[PDB]
Design an enzyme around this catalytic site. Structure first.
Site, short mmCIF file in Angstrom:
data_model
loop_
_atom_site.label_atom_id
_atom_site.label_comp_id
_atom_site.label_asym_id
_atom_site.label_seq_id
_atom_site.Cartn_x
_atom_site.Cartn_y
_atom_site.Cartn_z
N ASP A 121 0.78 -1.23 -0.02
CA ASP A 121 0.08 0.14 -0.15
C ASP A 121 0.86 1.20 0.18
N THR A 159 -7.09 3.63 -1.90
CA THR A 159 -6.72 2.12 -1.83
C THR A 159 -7.54 1.21 -2.18
N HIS A 265 1.50 8.91 5.12
CA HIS A 265 0.59 9.50 5.60
C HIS A 265 1.31 10.42 6.75
N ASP A 308 -0.76 -0.19 -5.00
CA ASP A 308 -1.90 0.26 -5.40
C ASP A 308 -1.94 1.86 -5.88
N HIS A 309 -1.04 2.79 -5.32
CA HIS A 309 -0.96 3.95 -5.71
C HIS A 309 0.53 4.49 -4.79
N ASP A 683 -20.62 10.98 -26.70
CA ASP A 683 -20.96 9.95 -25.53
C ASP A 683 -22.03 10.65 -24.80
N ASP A 687 -20.87 6.83 -20.86
CA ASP A 687 -20.41 5.52 -20.31
C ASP A 687 -19.24 5.26 -21.05
N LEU A 689 -18.33 4.63 -24.29
CA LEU A 689 -18.92 3.95 -25.30
C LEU A 689 -19.69 4.64 -26.43
N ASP A 691 -22.03 6.23 -28.71
CA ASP A 691 -23.90 6.36 -28.74
C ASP A 691 -24.29 5.93 -30.08
C1 LIG Z 1 -15.26 -2.04 -19.08
O1 LIG Z 1 -15.52 -3.27 -18.92
C2 LIG Z 1 -16.84 -3.83 -18.65
C3 LIG Z 1 -16.97 -5.13 -18.25
O2 LIG Z 1 -16.99 -5.67 -19.78
C4 LIG Z 1 -17.77 -2.78 -19.38
O3 LIG Z 1 -19.07 -3.19 -18.86
C5 LIG Z 1 -20.27 -3.73 -19.29
O4 LIG Z 1 -20.88 -2.88 -20.35
C6 LIG Z 1 -21.73 -3.57 -20.75
C7 LIG Z 1 -22.35 -2.83 -21.98
O5 LIG Z 1 -22.96 -1.73 -21.43
C8 LIG Z 1 -22.91 -4.09 -19.91
O6 LIG Z 1 -23.90 -4.66 -20.52
C9 LIG Z 1 -25.15 -4.73 -19.93
O7 LIG Z 1 -25.46 -5.77 -19.00
C10 LIG Z 1 -26.86 -5.85 -18.32
C11 LIG Z 1 -26.72 -6.73 -17.36
O8 LIG Z 1 -25.82 -6.42 -16.47
C12 LIG Z 1 -25.74 -7.22 -15.22
O9 LIG Z 1 -25.38 -8.59 -15.28
C13 LIG Z 1 -23.73 -8.47 -15.50
C14 LIG Z 1 -23.04 -9.71 -15.87
O10 LIG Z 1 -23.05 -10.64 -14.51
C15 LIG Z 1 -23.19 -7.75 -14.37
O11 LIG Z 1 -21.64 -7.52 -14.77
C16 LIG Z 1 -23.56 -6.26 -14.29
O12 LIG Z 1 -23.25 -5.77 -12.87
C17 LIG Z 1 -23.21 -4.17 -13.32
O13 LIG Z 1 -24.45 -3.79 -12.51
C18 LIG Z 1 -24.47 -3.74 -10.98
C19 LIG Z 1 -25.33 -2.75 -10.68
O14 LIG Z 1 -26.57 -3.36 -10.29
C20 LIG Z 1 -23.03 -3.56 -10.23
O15 LIG Z 1 -22.88 -4.40 -9.25
C21 LIG Z 1 -21.90 -3.88 -11.05
O16 LIG Z 1 -20.71 -3.00 -10.73
C22 LIG Z 1 -21.99 -3.44 -12.74
O17 LIG Z 1 -22.38 -2.02 -12.62
C23 LIG Z 1 -21.95 -1.47 -13.73
O18 LIG Z 1 -22.36 -1.71 -15.10
C24 LIG Z 1 -23.82 -1.21 -14.99
C25 LIG Z 1 -24.47 -1.44 -16.69
O19 LIG Z 1 -24.72 -2.88 -16.54
C26 LIG Z 1 -24.06 0.49 -14.83
O20 LIG Z 1 -25.31 0.92 -15.08
C27 LIG Z 1 -23.23 0.64 -13.55
O21 LIG Z 1 -23.27 2.11 -13.35
C28 LIG Z 1 -22.00 0.12 -13.61
O22 LIG Z 1 -20.99 1.01 -14.43
C29 LIG Z 1 -24.99 -6.63 -14.25
O23 LIG Z 1 -25.48 -7.06 -12.96
C30 LIG Z 1 -27.94 -5.59 -19.34
O24 LIG Z 1 -29.03 -5.48 -18.62
C31 LIG Z 1 -27.62 -4.47 -20.39
O25 LIG Z 1 -28.64 -4.84 -21.50
C32 LIG Z 1 -29.58 -3.67 -21.63
O26 LIG Z 1 -29.12 -2.76 -22.59
C33 LIG Z 1 -28.69 -3.52 -23.92
C34 LIG Z 1 -28.27 -2.43 -25.00
O27 LIG Z 1 -27.54 -3.43 -25.97
C35 LIG Z 1 -30.10 -4.08 -24.64
O28 LIG Z 1 -29.49 -5.00 -25.41
C36 LIG Z 1 -30.58 -5.02 -23.54
O29 LIG Z 1 -32.08 -5.39 -23.96
C37 LIG Z 1 -30.85 -4.16 -22.21
O30 LIG Z 1 -31.87 -3.01 -22.21
C38 LIG Z 1 -32.84 -3.07 -21.56
O31 LIG Z 1 -32.43 -2.55 -20.42
C39 LIG Z 1 -32.13 -1.13 -20.13
C40 LIG Z 1 -31.59 -0.58 -18.85
O32 LIG Z 1 -32.26 -1.04 -17.89
C41 LIG Z 1 -33.43 -0.53 -20.73
O33 LIG Z 1 -33.05 1.01 -20.99
C42 LIG Z 1 -33.91 -0.82 -22.23
O34 LIG Z 1 -35.03 -0.25 -22.48
C43 LIG Z 1 -34.14 -2.65 -21.91
O35 LIG Z 1 -35.24 -2.76 -21.26
C44 LIG Z 1 -26.31 -4.46 -20.99
O36 LIG Z 1 -26.01 -5.81 -21.85
C45 LIG Z 1 -22.40 -4.90 -18.72
O37 LIG Z 1 -23.04 -5.12 -17.86
C46 LIG Z 1 -21.21 -4.22 -18.17
N1 LIG Z 1 -20.38 -4.98 -17.11
C47 LIG Z 1 -19.87 -4.38 -16.13
C48 LIG Z 1 -19.06 -5.54 -15.06
O38 LIG Z 1 -19.91 -3.22 -15.66
C49 LIG Z 1 -17.41 -1.54 -19.65
O39 LIG Z 1 -18.57 -1.19 -20.63
C50 LIG Z 1 -15.88 -1.26 -20.10
N2 LIG Z 1 -15.77 0.14 -20.11
C51 LIG Z 1 -15.33 0.49 -21.24
C52 LIG Z 1 -15.10 2.03 -21.19
O40 LIG Z 1 -15.12 0.19 -22.03
C1 LIG Z 2 -7.00 -2.52 1.63
N1 LIG Z 2 -6.77 -3.16 2.98
C2 LIG Z 2 -7.28 -2.22 4.03
O1 LIG Z 2 -7.36 -1.07 3.90
N2 LIG Z 2 -7.39 -2.75 5.34
C3 LIG Z 2 -7.68 -1.97 6.50
C4 LIG Z 2 -6.94 -1.42 7.35
CL1 LIG Z 2 -5.15 -1.39 7.00
C5 LIG Z 2 -7.26 -0.57 8.46
C6 LIG Z 2 -8.62 -0.20 8.52
C7 LIG Z 2 -9.51 -0.88 7.71
C8 LIG Z 2 -9.17 -1.80 6.81
CL2 LIG Z 2 -10.41 -2.54 5.60
C9 LIG Z 2 -7.07 -4.43 5.83
C10 LIG Z 2 -6.82 -5.13 4.66
C11 LIG Z 2 -6.48 -6.37 4.76
N3 LIG Z 2 -6.18 -7.27 3.80
C12 LIG Z 2 -6.19 -6.42 2.49
N4 LIG Z 2 -5.86 -7.47 1.34
C13 LIG Z 2 -5.98 -6.88 -0.01
C14 LIG Z 2 -5.64 -8.27 -0.80
O2 LIG Z 2 -4.43 -8.90 -0.66
C15 LIG Z 2 -5.75 -7.72 -2.28
C16 LIG Z 2 -6.82 -7.44 -2.89
C17 LIG Z 2 -7.15 -7.16 -4.24
C18 LIG Z 2 -5.76 -6.99 -5.04
C19 LIG Z 2 -4.49 -7.64 -4.48
C20 LIG Z 2 -4.72 -7.72 -2.95
N5 LIG Z 2 -6.43 -5.34 2.38
C21 LIG Z 2 -6.59 -4.58 3.40
CA LIG Z 3 -22.34 6.21 -24.85
ZN LIG Z 4 -3.21 5.92 2.24
#
Ligand SMILES: *[C@@H]1O[C@H](CO)[C@@H](O[C@@H]2O[C@H](CO)[C@@H](O[C@@H]3O[C@H](CO[C@H]4O[C@H](CO)[C@@H](O)[C@H](O[C@H]5O[C@H](CO)[C@@H](O)[C@H](O)[C@@H]5O[C@H]5O[C@H](CO)[C@@H](O)[C@H](O)[C@@H]5O)[C@@H]4O)[C@@H](O)[C@H](O[C@H]4O[C@H](CO)[C@@H](O)[C@H](O)[C@@H]4O[C@H]4O[C@H](CO)[C@@H](O)[C@H](O)[C@@H]4O)[C@@H]3O)[C@H](O)[C@H]2NC(C)=O)[C@H](O)[C@H]1NC(C)=O
Ligand SMILES: CN1C(=O)N(c2c(Cl)cccc2Cl)Cc2cnc(NC[C@H](O)c3ccccc3)nc21
Ligand SMILES: [Ca+2]
Ligand SMILES: [Zn+2]
Ligand SMILES: [Cl-]
Ligand SMILES: [K+]
Ligand code: NA
EC number: 3.1.4.39
Length: 806
Positions: A121, A159, A265, A308-309, A683, A687, A689, A691
């Site tokens: 870290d 971090t 720090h 990490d940074h 865009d 996102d 990507l 439009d």
């Molecule tokens: C960097 O890499 C990443 C990973 O490849 C890229 O991100 C992907 O982009 C894809 C294209 O946009 C996107 O695909 C969508 O998936 C939807 C289903 O997603 C769920 O399942 C996946 C798979 O397990 C999962 O990974 C997702 O997790 C996201 O969401 C939760 C939040 O609830 C978070 O826990 C997680 O962090 C992640 O969030 C991020 O992504 C979402 C978008 O999915 C953002 O909104 C968040 O802010 C955050 O950034 C999900 O659990 C699927 O529903 C989509 O499909 C809709 O749109 C398409 C258009 O083609 C259409 O065909 C479908 O029919 C559908 O449309 C319908 O729904 C619309 C919205 O509700 C609605 O408007 C319409 O009318 C329709 O009804 C879409 O396919 C993919 O999920 C993400 N993956 C991840 C991990 O982020 C990213 O683009 C890359 N970046 C760059 C710059 O290149």
């Molecule tokens: C980030 N980090 C913290 O900030 N910690 C913490 C401290 Cl020091 C004080 C108060 C509160 C918290 Cl949570 C404990 C801690 C413990 N173990 C890990 N493992 C990171 C793991 O190995 C890993 C994950 C992704 C990619 C490569 C490596 N990370 C921690």
């Molecule tokens: Ca866009």
């Molecule tokens: Zn720090």
């Protein structure tokens, strides 16, 4: 409730966690207050310390000891790491010459070389050189393995965002860990470093490496370590896991160190107090390598040493206070420090207006040490907008500074001398990468690269298929001896049309005029050849970009430039041209000042029109190929074609004109010719990507001419600048930008001055990777070069940062 009434006997640091009311014995139980009563006694033994001594050699096993020096310890897998050195005459790993590791040299039963991630870290990139004298184990890893001069973190350079990016290959906006502190408005829940809510699985998106491994049948050690478990115990636990039987032994492990961040720090990145934490980290690495060597694993395991940074000098007195700018300061919530994020303190406050907050924070003080942005106006390279957890208002804080809401926050909450979190191109935020092992190269330096790339490589190292992520798989092939990933170029989805002359001048009623009716088979055969593509080899050096989505477009050839013209968006998706070192800048002649010419290859129905610009009082136009750089007076007429025109705010034209008139020639002169590809980006949903047509929020008034959110350019030349851009034999050199298409220059506080005093600074801030442009356009560049595709992928991920040397 946890009925902590079970026992940890034979369960110490169990890899599969048990569900309450059964008490836990895993390396996280302390964090949940759920350890069994005997966890400390059995699992955190400390008796006799961490090193063997001469008198302990051959001792009778005493289970109370923290580690062992008995004859049976090696097969038990629990010797102190220096056992063989003290008791069996072995040398420490650091004292051994290094020797190329050509193949994994693993004990029978290992199906793959294990991977150990040693994450530190706050380990700033310049520590490798500046601390080299006190870190002999790390220096051996670095000089004998594969290393980069630095590795770029993600923004914010905090971090949790960075460690989770390392684990997933994703930008914070996609994985959802967008800061160390966050509020999610959909959950109506807060995430903090301290506390329990951070353990809820709903915060953590994507698929981290331990889950990727498990799902594909590869076992993982637990990555997280309770802060109270000392480092020596973490190392011994990993070594014990590595001695498990084949069916139970993990293949992937992580160690984590809170240092040097913790001391950084308090003391600043280079405080005199910083030497000891660096020595201590090195000693820990020594313990791991000695321990691996004892187990005959030191030429079997791939080790990644990664930060990490970095860490910057930051003190309380370098704080900007929003109370000095806002009259309404109590109506806002600020996430403070090395970045700022602002939202309304109360959603029932109808008077809250982000536009007036921004305005009150814009260029108010001569040396103002932060700059306000709506998140969608942040530099695209930061990829920091497409998540509901990122507030609409963002403050980019100058390195060395903090932002706070009110002075009471800073003196009622100087203690610290270092912090991090700033823009990820800032030199002090850069961190480290070293890879050492059979799968990495020997004694090899690689160029700096971004931490989003490592997930793919760690998957390659374990034979895993990576989940979808933001790395460019193959771009780090040059780090690896074997297990490289050999991708194929994506298939073009849309083929172009090549229209010829199909329309008469009088079919166009565009409200456009040009003084061009001033008219010979020498030069008429010549101009027809150019329109057929006779100079295309000069202006399209790396092949035409491939269109990776379904659309309708035309290739248009000209003497000085080639373009892919979109019939849907009514403008080029890309325009490509080469400017040699010798090229001359001319002016737009007087009679052509407002000239726009219909393009007889392209129907009126698929053209822009000048009347729409006349009617739109806010919107003007520019050209993608600059008239200033025409090869001859006759070629200059091509630059005024309606098919080379794009919508531009007058404020943006100031930027664009300086780039085209001054900077292109400057680069051609410095780099021995440049090839430029320029184009629009849409865009609107920020996102990152491209439009679709139905996503466009703004048009030129009364028309179907869509307004770009950004304009890009990709500027390519020979890495060996003694060869001209258009006659390059080897590797390429690139710099690119994605400039925001804004109706004002509020972003630039000195924009009332001559463009020579502020435009280049704006362009530097909006530097970009070609890969960022690819995402934003659905285009694929560099399709036809003589270079290996992996090399081209590395080129596409390059970012020109404009920072001085580290
Ligand atoms: C960097 O890499 C990443 C990973 O490849 C890229 O991100 C992907 O982009 C894809 C294209 O946009 C996107 O695909 C969508 O998936 C939807 C289903 O997603 C769920 O399942 C996946 C798979 O397990 C999962 O990974 C997702 O997790 C996201 O969401 C939760 C939040 O609830 C978070 O826990 C997680 O962090 C992640 O969030 C991020 O992504 C979402 C978008 O999915 C953002 O909104 C968040 O802010 C955050 O950034 C999900 O659990 C699927 O529903 C989509 O499909 C809709 O749109 C398409 C258009 O083609 C259409 O065909 C479908 O029919 C559908 O449309 C319908 O729904 C619309 C919205 O509700 C609605 O408007 C319409 O009318 C329709 O009804 C879409 O396919 C993919 O999920 C993400 N993956 C991840 C991990 O982020 C990213 O683009 C890359 N970046 C760059 C710059 O290149
Ligand atoms: C980030 N980090 C913290 O900030 N910690 C913490 C401290 Cl020091 C004080 C108060 C509160 C918290 Cl949570 C404990 C801690 C413990 N173990 C890990 N493992 C990171 C793991 O190995 C890993 C994950 C992704 C990619 C490569 C490596 N990370 C921690
Ligand atoms: Ca866009
Ligand atoms: Zn720090
Ligand atoms: Cl934060
Ligand atoms: K206008
Ligand atoms: Na300004």
């Amino acid at each position: 409730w946890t009925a902590t009434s079970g026992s940890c006997k034979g369960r110490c640091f169990e890899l599969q966690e048990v569900g309450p009311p059964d008490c836990r014995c895993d390396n996280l139980c302390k964090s949940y207050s759920s350890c069994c009563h005997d966890f400390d006694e059995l699992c955190l033994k400390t008796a006799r310390g961490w090193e063997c001594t001469k008198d302990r050699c051959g001792e009778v096993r005493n289970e109370e000891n923290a580690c062992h020096c008995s004859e049976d310890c090696l097969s038990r897998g629990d010797c102190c790491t220096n056992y063989q050195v003290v008791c069996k005459g072995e040398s420490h790993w650091v004292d051994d010459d290094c020797e190329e590791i050509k193949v994994p040299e693993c004990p029978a039963g290992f199906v793959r070389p294990p991977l150990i991630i040693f994450s530190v870290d706050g380990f700033r990139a310049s520590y490798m050189k500046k601390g080299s004298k006190v870190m002999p184990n790390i220096e051996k890893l670095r000089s004998c393995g594969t290393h980069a001069p630095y590795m770029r973190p993600v923004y914010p350079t905090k971090t949790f965002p960075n460690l989770y990016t390392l684990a997933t290959g994703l930008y914070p906006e996609s994985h959802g860990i967008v800061g160390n502190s966050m509020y999610d408005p959909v959950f109506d829940a807060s995430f903090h470093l301290r506390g329990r809510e951070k353990f809820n699985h709903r915060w953590w998106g994507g698929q981290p490496l331990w889950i990727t491994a498990t799902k594909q049948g590869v076992r993982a050690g637990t990555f997280f370590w309770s802060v109270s478990i000392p480092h020596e115990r973490r190392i011994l636990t990993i070594l014990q896991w590595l001695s498990l039987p084949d069916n139970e032994r993990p293949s992937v492990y992580a160690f984590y160190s809170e240092q040097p961040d913790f001391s950084g720090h308090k003391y600043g990145p280079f405080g005199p107090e910083m030497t000891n934490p660096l020595r201590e980290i090195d000693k820990t690495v020594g313990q791991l390598m000695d321990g691996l060597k004892q187990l005959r694993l030191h030429r079997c395991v791939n080790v990644i040493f990664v930060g990490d940074h970095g860490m910057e000098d930051v003190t309380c007195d370098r704080t900007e206070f929003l109370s000095n700018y806002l009259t309404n300061v109590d109506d806002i919530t600020l996430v403070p420090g090395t970045l700022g994020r602002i939202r309304a303190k109360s959603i029932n406050n109808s008077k809250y207006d982000p536009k007036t907050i921004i305005a009150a924070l814009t260029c108010k003080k001569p040396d103002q040490h932060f700059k306000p942005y709506m998140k969608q106006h942040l530099p695209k390279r930061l990829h920091y907008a497409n998540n509901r957890r990122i507030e609409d208002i963002h403050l980019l804080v100058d390195r060395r500074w903090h932002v706070a809401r009110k002075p009471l926050d800073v003196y009622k909450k100087c203690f610290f001398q270092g912090d991090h979190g700033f823009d990820n191109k800032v030199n002090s935020m850069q961190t480290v990468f070293v890879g050492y092992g059979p799968t990495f190269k020997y004694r090899t330096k690689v160029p700096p690269f971004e931490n989003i790339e490592l997930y793919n490589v760690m998957c390659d190292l374990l034979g895993l298929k990576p989940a979808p992520n933001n790395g460019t798989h193959g771009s780090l092939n040059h780090l690896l001896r074997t297990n490289t990933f050999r991708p194929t170029m994506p298939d073009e989805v849309s083929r172009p049309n090549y229209p010829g002359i199909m329309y008469l001048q009088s079919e166009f009623d565009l409200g456009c005029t040009c003084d061009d009716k001033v008219e010979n088979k020498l030069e008429e055969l010549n101009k027809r050849l150019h329109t057929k593509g006779s100079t295309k080899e000069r202006h399209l050096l790396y092949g035409r970009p491939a269109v990776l989505y379904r659309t309708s477009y035309d290739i248009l050839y000209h003497t000085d430039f080639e373009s892919g013209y979109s019939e849907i968006f009514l403008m080029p998706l890309w325009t490509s041209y080469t400017i040699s070192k010798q090229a001359e800048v001319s002016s737009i002649p007087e009679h052509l000042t407002n000239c726009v010419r219909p393009d007889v290859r392209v129907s009126p129905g698929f053209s822009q029109n000048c009347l729409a610009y006349k009617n739109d009082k806010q919107m003007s136009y520019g050209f993608l190929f600059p008239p200033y750089l025409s090869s001859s007076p006759e070629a200059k007429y091509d630059a005024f074609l309606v098919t080379n025109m794009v919508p531009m705010y007058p404020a943006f034209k100031r930027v664009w004109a300086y780039f085209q008139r001054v900077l292109v020639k400057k680069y051609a002169s410095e780099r021995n010719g440049v090839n430029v590809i320029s184009g629009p980006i849409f865009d609107y949903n920020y996102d990152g990507l491209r439009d679709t047509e139905d996503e466009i929020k703004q048009y030129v008034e009364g028309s179907s001419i869509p307004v770009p959110t950004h304009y890009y350019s990709i500027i390519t030349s020979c890495l060996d600048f003694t060869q001209p851009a258009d006659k390059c034999d080897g590797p390429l050199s690139v710099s690119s930008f994605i400039l925001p298409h804004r109706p004002d220059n509020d972003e630039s506080c000195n924009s009332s001055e001559d463009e020579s005093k502020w435009v280049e600074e704006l362009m530097k801030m909006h530097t970009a990777r070609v890969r960022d442009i690819e995402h934003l356009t659905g285009l694929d560049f560099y399709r036809k070069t003589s270079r290996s595709y992996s090399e081209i992928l590395t080129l596409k991920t390059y970012l020109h940062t404009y920072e001085s040397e580290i």
